[PDB]
Amino acid sequence: PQVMDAKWALQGNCVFLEHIEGEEIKFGTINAENGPVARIQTYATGFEY
C-alpha cells in the first residue's frame, strides 16, 4: 500500500509485593503497545528529443 499500518501488541503488568498475613493481594494491569507507520513515494524523470 501507499501507507503501511502499525503493528499492535498487548502486554500485562504485575509486581510481587510482600504479603505479611491476611493482606489483600494487589491486582495487576494490562497495557497496549503499537508500532510505527511507513509510506512510499514516487520519483520519476525522463527525456524528450
Add this chain to the structure above:
Amino acid sequence: PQVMDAKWALQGNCVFLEHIEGEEIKFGTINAENGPVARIQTYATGFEY
C-alpha cells in the same frame, strides 16, 4: 519454618603462662558461641479480569 534457629557450639579457652617452680597452675574456661537467625517471607500478586 518461618524462622530458623541459631547454631550453637562450645569451645575451651586456655592460655599457657610461665611456671617458676612451686607456682600453682592456673585453670582455663569454656564458652558457648551461637550463630545467626534467618526468616522467610511471602510475596504475591494477581489479576482480576
